[PDB]
Structure formats: structure tokens, C-alpha cells
Symmetry: D3
Subunit: 126 residues, 6 copies
Amino acid sequence: MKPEIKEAYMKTAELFSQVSNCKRMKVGAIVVKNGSILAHGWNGTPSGFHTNCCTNPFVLHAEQNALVKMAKSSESIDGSELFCTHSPCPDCSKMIAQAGVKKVYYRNETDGIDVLQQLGVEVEKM
Amino acid sequence: MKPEIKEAYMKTAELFSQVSNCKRMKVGAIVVKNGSILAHGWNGTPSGFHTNCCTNPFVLHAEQNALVKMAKSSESIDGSELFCTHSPCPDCSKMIAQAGVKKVYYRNETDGIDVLQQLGVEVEKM
Amino acid sequence: MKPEIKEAYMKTAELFSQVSNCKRMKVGAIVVKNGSILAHGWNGTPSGFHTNCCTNPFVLHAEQNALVKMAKSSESIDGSELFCTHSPCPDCSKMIAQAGVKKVYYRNETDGIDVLQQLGVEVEKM
Amino acid sequence: MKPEIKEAYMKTAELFSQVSNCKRMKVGAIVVKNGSILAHGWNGTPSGFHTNCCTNPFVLHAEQNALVKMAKSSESIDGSELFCTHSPCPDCSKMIAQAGVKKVYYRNETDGIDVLQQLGVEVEKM
Amino acid sequence: MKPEIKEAYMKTAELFSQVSNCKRMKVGAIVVKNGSILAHGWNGTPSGFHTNCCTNPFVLHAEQNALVKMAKSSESIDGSELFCTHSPCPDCSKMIAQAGVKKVYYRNETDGIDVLQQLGVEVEKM
Amino acid sequence: MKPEIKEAYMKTAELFSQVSNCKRMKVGAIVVKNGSILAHGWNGTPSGFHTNCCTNPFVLHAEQNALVKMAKSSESIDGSELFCTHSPCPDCSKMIAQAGVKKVYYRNETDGIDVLQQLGVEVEKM
Ligand SMILES: [Cl-]
Ligand SMILES: [Cl-]
Ligand SMILES: [Cl-]
Ligand SMILES: [Cl-]
Ligand SMILES: [Cl-]
Ligand SMILES: [Cl-]
Ligand SMILES: [Zn+2]
Ligand SMILES: [Zn+2]
Ligand SMILES: [Zn+2]
Ligand SMILES: [Zn+2]
Ligand SMILES: [Zn+2]
Ligand SMILES: [Zn+2]
């Protein structure tokens, strides 16, 4: 994909990180496949949870949200790419790799990273 | 959907309007359904067209691009909402209505608009 | 595909051209992929429009109708073939090419045609 | 659906019955859902079978072909309607009912018929 | 797929054969594709049929049930594999081959079998 | 669903728990929707991981595996039911609820459980 489009994806993930409500870290994620956004996600508590403030074991990471949206989508996550504001944790990394995510782009930085690479997911900081 | 999420959608459509190459008008569109972005689009020439500069009868409107992406998606466009930077032309309006697009949000302004309403699509400027 | 099947497709597009209500031109279209019809379409006004008579800027071309049906389908339009009674206009041509339509078959005849070819869509009159 | 559209469906099933190669009976079927054809089928031997002539236990009924195409489609057969040139046999009837086919339209005539009705599928001769 | 997984599939088909109500033969089937079960099925009468006891011409074979479930699924049956407790009859065989079923595994044993092979479906007893 | 079918689901989840390689706990999960299994899963390391032995932070829970398979499926996880051999952990619970899983059935037993209930997922031990 051309350079300026790559950046538009990352900035979108950034747009969505700011929707989140966590004071510790705001994270956004975007799934892209075949020239199309398929899912977005940010970090926080599940829809219909009581407390909005996050750190709480029941808040989902941005990548978890995107992934769950893909599970309710009709479109496969396999072969897609993940644009995230942050490098993913080890728990998101396992799932991303098993999901057939081709590559992860992150803006902000580390175990998650080397495991993704071990497992054949490509990684690029931008 | 909460107010600040509505705005994040419009700003995303704006992010994508700026990817376009037309000097007359830069337009972005975003399809949203069930809390998820499903397609994006901007105005310009078809992939693999020779001249990048647009006005040329062969440039697609942002809404046409989003729509075509929905046609290659596995996910239905019916019941979704369109966030566009601009009010749509009459040609996009016909298709949006026939596609079962529930509502169109636009930032920038007019026949397209009243026809969408005639045809039962909701409209809101934001 | 065998010759007589090709013809059955064109005759079906013809069956549907005659459902239309336009006095100027009756057009039918049929999307085929992997041995299966996926969509059909004819020219006319959008469902729930007041006047049935078409020429009016709010009537959709047969190809626009088929395309919109594909957008509400779960099945991708990419790699399919279009059987139309008529050569498509430039506006339908842009969309057909961007949709990944592999080839267009038409019965009745011209800018749309050369652009489709420029853009890598195959074309055959039958 | 309007009357003349109903007829266009039946005539399409008829277009496809004539593609078949069986000397005993030529049958066509068409699946329709939400204003769109999703599958077609006719009676005959499986793709890549040696003898084209049918009666042979290895020829599929038109309804079996349509059904198998639906199984390879991404679009559900549930809630669709079947237009067939002929009333279906008991073996097709079982499957049609279990498939959630809403209604069957046939042109030409009888156990299959009453079972479809027992099982809550609607039936109409046209 | 590893050996012990193959067996887990067959045992699942066996789990489901025992749900059936036929005194003559209890059959189970399982569709597998890309490491995932997509459908299951057993032999018996259609949902909402009056008599539960089967032999009756209106009972579906396990393979017919799985196939019908695939037709109501969004996921294609093409390229999948069938695990059945029994070798399939000729009527199921025609459909399995036309469905693009890659291979059939059966536990219990014969025309269906050679036709599947004629038609390019692989077969293995286990 | 009838009682004996409920049990066949749980026994299938059990069939798959035994495929796993973890010495601490073997877990199986099964997704069911509209009378059809859509996904299965067990606990362990990601495909292509080096060490098969699990406890390791890079092993996925059975529910995580099923969920990831749903993300690569064309079929939505929303409105489905989860049969698991075990009550789910808090991390699986968040995701299950956000996924629109209607109800979870487990065989073996506790925070995950009350949160699922807080969040409107039904729960039943069997
Ligand atoms: Cl999915
Ligand atoms: Cl589509
Ligand atoms: Cl679509
Ligand atoms: Cl299917
Ligand atoms: Cl289907
Ligand atoms: Cl999915
Ligand atoms: Zn994480
Ligand atoms: Zn426009
Ligand atoms: Zn046109
Ligand atoms: Zn029949
Ligand atoms: Zn059989
Ligand atoms: Zn867990």
C-alpha cells in the first residue's frame, strides 16, 4: 500500500485510542484487509459493564475488541493486518498469531513483539 | 451511539478525504454497522488507471468506492450508516437508498439530500 | 463455460430487461460467479420511489442494481462476470472495474467499453 | 413480489431446464431471496462424470443442484423461495423443508407436495 | 492433520450417530474445513415431522443433514472434508462430489464409494 | 434443544479437551448456533510454536481458540452458545460477553462466572 495510506490507518487507530476511558493507557486498533478497514477497537470495559473506569481485570485491550468484532463479522481475520497505537501484550500476541494476522504495525513500543515474530507474523514500527 | 464516537467516525472520513488527489473536492466516506467500520472510500480514479489527476468522468465518488468495497465484502451494506465529509450527489443518493443504508451523516453541504429523505434514508449534518 | 450456458445467461438478462418500465431503453444485468447467478438487475427507479416512469436522474441502470444487490449479499462480486443486454455507460464501467468484475458480456452496443479494457476487464459481444 | 416478476423467475427456471441433457425430463430450479436470485440448477450428471446421458442413479435433480450451490455459497438458503419447473420428488422435498425454504413455486405437476405442506413449506402452482 | 485429531472427528460423528432414532441404522456425519467443524448431522426425520420413527422415504441421511446445514451456513462446503460413521449411499455421494467435498473418511462400510472416487473425491476407511 | 443433544455437545467438548497437551488442565470448547457446531477449541500453544508443553503465558485457552476460529469463520459468534468442559477464566469471560455469546454451559467449576452473569450471558452447569 502507498506510504500515506499506511499513515492514514495509524492515525485512525489513534482517533479511536482517544475514545477510550483508561487513564493509564489509551490504545486503538484497526483491522485492514484487501484495501478495506474491517474492524476497530479500543481499550476499556465491556458494553453494559457498570464502572466505566479501567488496572481492572475486566477491561479488554484494543486488539481484543477488534478481534471480537471480527468474530461477529462475516469477513475472515485471516490474511489481514493490524494497525495498533501500541505494541501488543503477550495475550493479544498469541491470538493475533493464531488468527492468521499477516502483519502488525505499531506506533508506540516487548515480549509480545518477539513472539509474533517467532510465530511468523511480520512487525513494523511507524 | 455516544456523541464522541459519532465524531470519531466523521473525523475518520476526513482522514480519508485527504488521501484523495482531486484538486476540486476531497471527499471521504465510512460505512458503519453494528459498532464496526466496514468500508472506507475517497474520491478518485480507479486502481490501475493511468492519470491520477481527476472533472474527469472516470473518477469515482467516495460513496461509490465504499459501496464497491461493500460489494466485495462478505458483510451486507443493508442497515448500515454512511459517514461522509460531503452531502452526496444524486447518483450516489440513488444507490445509497437502494442499498438499504439506514442513515447518512455529512459534515459539508442539495437534491441528493431531499431524495434520500423521500426514499426513507435519514439524514443529519454534524 | 459451455456455449449454450453462456447464452442462457444472456437470455436471462433479457428476461429481466423486460421487467423494467423505461420507454427509452430496457436493460437487464446478471452477475455470475463459480457457476452460479448471484444477482440480477434492471433499469428503473428505486424501490419506494413515487413515479415509476423513468430521462430522470434518479433511475438506476441495470448494472447499478446488480451491484447494489451484491453489496447486500454475503458473496463477493470480485472475480465474477457480468452479463448485460447492453454495453455499459462510463459510470457503470468505473464501478464494474473497481468491483473486480473479471469480464463483461453484452448483447447490444462505446466509451464504457474501451475504459473497461484499459482497466483490465475483459469484454465480449454475443 | 409483483406478478410479472414472479413469472420472470419461472421463465428463468425454464431457461435452465433446457440446458439439461435428460430425455425423460428437463427440470430447472431457481433460488430467490430478498429480491435476488442466489442459485440455479438443472437435472443431470455431476461435473466431470463420464456419460452425459441420464434413469441413472447418479443424476442430480435440479433442486439438488441448486441446494448444493447454496452450500458452496456464503448466503443462507433459509427464508428463500424455490422456483422450479416441476413439483419436487419426495427426496428433494425433505431437503427443501429442512433447508428452511419458505415456499416452492412450480409450473408442472404428488407426495413431495403434501409433505412440503405438512412440514410448513408453502406451495403454489403457476 | 495429526492422527489423534482425525480420530476425535470420527468419534464426534459417532457421538452424533447415537442421537438418531432409527432402529435400522444410526449414522453421524461431521464437516471439517480449515481446522474447524462447520456442520454435524445424523439420520432421521425432518424437524417438525410427526412420527419420530424412521424405512420411511422422508428420513434424511446424516450427510443430507450436514449438507443442508451447510446451505444455511455462511461458510462454503467446497474444500471441506466429511467424517461419517458410514460409507455414503449413491444419493449422498452425488451431492458430496458436486459440493466440492475434498475427501470422505468413514468408519463402517459400496457403489457410493467408487463413484466418489470416479468423481475425484478421496476416500479413507479408519 | 432436547436434553440428549445438550449432552452430546458437552461430550464433544470433552472429546476435544483430550487432544490438548497440558498436564495441568485439559479443556475443550464448542460453539453452537442454530443447531450447528461452528467451532471447537482446546487449550495449548499456537500452531507452529516450538515447545508443545504448556504455566506458559503463550498457551491459549480453549475458549480463546474457539473465538479465534470464529474470527476466521464467515459465521457470526453473536447469539451462539458455548459448551466448555470448564468454567471460563476472567479473560475468556470478558471476550465471551463482548462476543454476544448468549449462554455458556460448563461441566467443571469462579469470578469468570459472576461476571458473565453481570454482563447478561446466561450460565448453566451440567
Ligand atoms: Cl465470524
Ligand atoms: Cl458482497
Ligand atoms: Cl456484501
Ligand atoms: Cl454455505
Ligand atoms: Cl450457504
Ligand atoms: Cl469472521
Ligand atoms: Zn494486549
Ligand atoms: Zn456522488
Ligand atoms: Zn450505466
Ligand atoms: Zn427430486
Ligand atoms: Zn445416503
Ligand atoms: Zn480462560
